[PDB]
Design a binder for this molecule. Structure first.
Ligand SMILES: C=CC[S@](=O)C[C@H](N)C(=O)O
Lengths: 383, 380
């Protein structure tokens, strides 16, 4: 092969409070959205240098927005640094922007099936989910007429738009300006969560919503973070990109009010290192991930009873309807007999009750064992 | 056994130290100029070597560390305990969950200015039963009960030990307040983030210790952040005896996005609560020393360091007849010493300065001379 500068073979050893690896003998979790790779050693170096030995209150330096705008220029479209505001997390920032830009009672449009934490922060904040469901016929599709009639609804004040879309792994262009343009037209804030934007495995690119014509650029917020990209979920560093100057200043005051406007001790130095010294680690990763998807899509093509969707952005969305069993029970039964743990599609709503989600961001050895645990689980049902 | 003489060299984005002029001495904002406990430090660099930082739950050891630590004071039941990334944000979330917009929320002015940000910024209304200032503050118990009895007063933010006065309330006072709140079905939020830093052996009585008339109406908030110089760790704990109250506050932490620990919060905090007793014992001796050196030097008799039993020195400048802000502004100007104006704390704060003493005695030396220097140029 072409020798990889960095280690994509060795599974980090987590402490016992890890959600993914914490709490049975010979069990294999591929459900929760975090990698099983060591982070880039260039980020590790930045973290270690910061650990000054006194960790008092921290401000957000102009060097953070500069690394952010640079990464987005080099890897995708350069935002203005003035557009940027730090927040400690994507979902935290959404939740605060729900509380800031909508009222209790207001509806918030999503596209089911979608990341299950969207429902929690909309419903838990006393707003109401409305969905222009995604049409499934081995691809999903947008019922645009149904999308427009929901946006025009007076009580529909926000669209939370997954770009690219978890869990179907779909990277939306042109579709994104339409969506922006329809939001603007009906005066609906478009919140573009782009947390998976860097992990497009095809060289299709994501279209950040902040790049839309000024006709609609005043109705958009893009959210990025290094977190899913460099395996730093617990770093609590994200970035809202908000061109409308009043919008942005109001987002920022609510981040403060919520307690998610100030960086923790490593959020600044590690994020800057990722955004400025992480291109080469990512490019290599993307080769390991492409290789894992190929291996998995190919092996499942041994299990004809399931149908993987055509992804274009590391999670595999797998159609298990043929087994004629509910994904919650399948995932339960599959676990108890094989020790493989994958995430049932129920929680993602839409047609999720027919699907399962398998996280392939792990060394190939675990992709093999995983896929084959899955084949075992299927074989036992037919016997 | 531990270093309290050399000031950590911060990166450029420190609030306290970032972007200061030459020859400027920051003694205003509440973080220390000491390196942290090596045992804490250790746990941080071990966690880092994991080299992958995905989602972390809160382990029961975190609540056991917290209960064991509370040796220092009172043992909360481990089930009562709920992680949140910080004290003020959990105050912010409990305001939104437990009151309605327009409701009133009672402080005892003068108090820590962040209490007004979270009360007013959430569209709630501040009402104060001012503490009666007579070189010390006292409580008007008649006034406090009338206000708590007002139907639109739904909550009370109680600072215990009370910042900026530096006063750790009596077991008597603490339970009397909890009885009145419960009498009048007002929720009592006990900010106890300074409880580990009472300089006298006069220990804090955490609101969670009050008995079952009123234990159902209390919430205690603690945190290693002030004690161990960890404001950027984002690790804290709410102690909430009432379980239906506890379950609700927990879902409000999760929606605010403060209910989940960062990559360091859990192991550093467990390190602090399990092994930081000796480090802290030695910190407190450094602080009684600098408090001692501070009051004797100022006794500047036109100012009055009033009796603090817990490291921010609340200094009365009423005899110089100068507004705190205009004073602290003029001080920074000619002398370079930066100190917190009392105005932001409301009450009678505009006649007081707050002075941070958690720095090596040499910086305390330099600051006190600077302050005296200032007081003399006003008279020339
Ligand atoms: C604790 C359960 C919710 S979990 O942390 C959300 C995560 N991105 C996932 O992939 O499920």
């Amino acid at each position: 092969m072409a020798e990889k500068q960095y280690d994509f073979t060795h599974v980090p050893k987590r402490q016992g409070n890890s959600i993914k690896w914490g709490g049975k003998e010979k069990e294999l979790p591929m459900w929760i959205d975090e990698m099983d790779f060591r982070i880039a050693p260039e980020i590790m170096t930045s973290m270690e240098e910061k650990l000054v030995a006194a960790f008092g209150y921290e401000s957000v330096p102009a060097e953070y927005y500069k690394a952010v705008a640079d990464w987005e220029e080099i890897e995708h479209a350069r935002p203005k640094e003035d557009w940027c505001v730090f927040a400690s997390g994507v979902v935290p920032a959404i939740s605060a922007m729900v509380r800031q830009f909508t009222s209790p009672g207001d509806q918030i449009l999503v596209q089911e099936p979608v990341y299950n934490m969207f429902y929690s922060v909309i419903e838990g904040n006393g707003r109401r989910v409305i969905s222009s469901d995604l049409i499934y016929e081995s691809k999903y599709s947008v019922n645009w007429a149904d999308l427009e009639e929901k946006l025009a609804t007076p009580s529909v004040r926000m669209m939370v738009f997954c770009n690219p879309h978890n869990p179907i792994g779909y990277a939306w262009e042109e579709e994104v300006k339409r969506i922006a343009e329809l939001c603007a037209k009906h005066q609906v804030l478009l919140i573009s969560d782009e947390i998976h934007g860097d992990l497009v495995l095809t060289d299709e690119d994501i279209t950040p919503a902040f790049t839309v014509d000024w006709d609609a650029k005043n109705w958009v917020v893009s959210l990025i973070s290094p977190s899913k990209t460099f395996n730093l979920a617990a770093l609590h560093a994200a970035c809202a990109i908000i061109p409308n100057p009043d919008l942005r200043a109001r987002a920022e005051e609510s981040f403060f009010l919520a307690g998610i406007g100030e960086p923790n001790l490593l959020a600044i130095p590690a994020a800057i290192a990722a955004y400025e010294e992480g291109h080469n680690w990512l490019r290599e990763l993307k080769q390991v991930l492409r290789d894992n998807f190929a291996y998995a899509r190919e092996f499942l093509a041994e299990v004809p009873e399931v149908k993987v969707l055509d992804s274009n952005a590391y999670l595999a969305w797998v159609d298990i309807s043929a087994l004629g069993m509910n994904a919650e029970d399948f995932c339960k039964y599959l676990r108890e007999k094989t020790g493989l743990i994958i995430s049932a599609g129920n929680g993602y709503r839409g047609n999720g009750h027919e699907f399962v989600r398998i996280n392939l961001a792990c060394p190939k050895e675990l992709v093999i064992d995983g896929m084959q645990r899955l084949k075992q689980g299927v074989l036992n049902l037919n016997n």
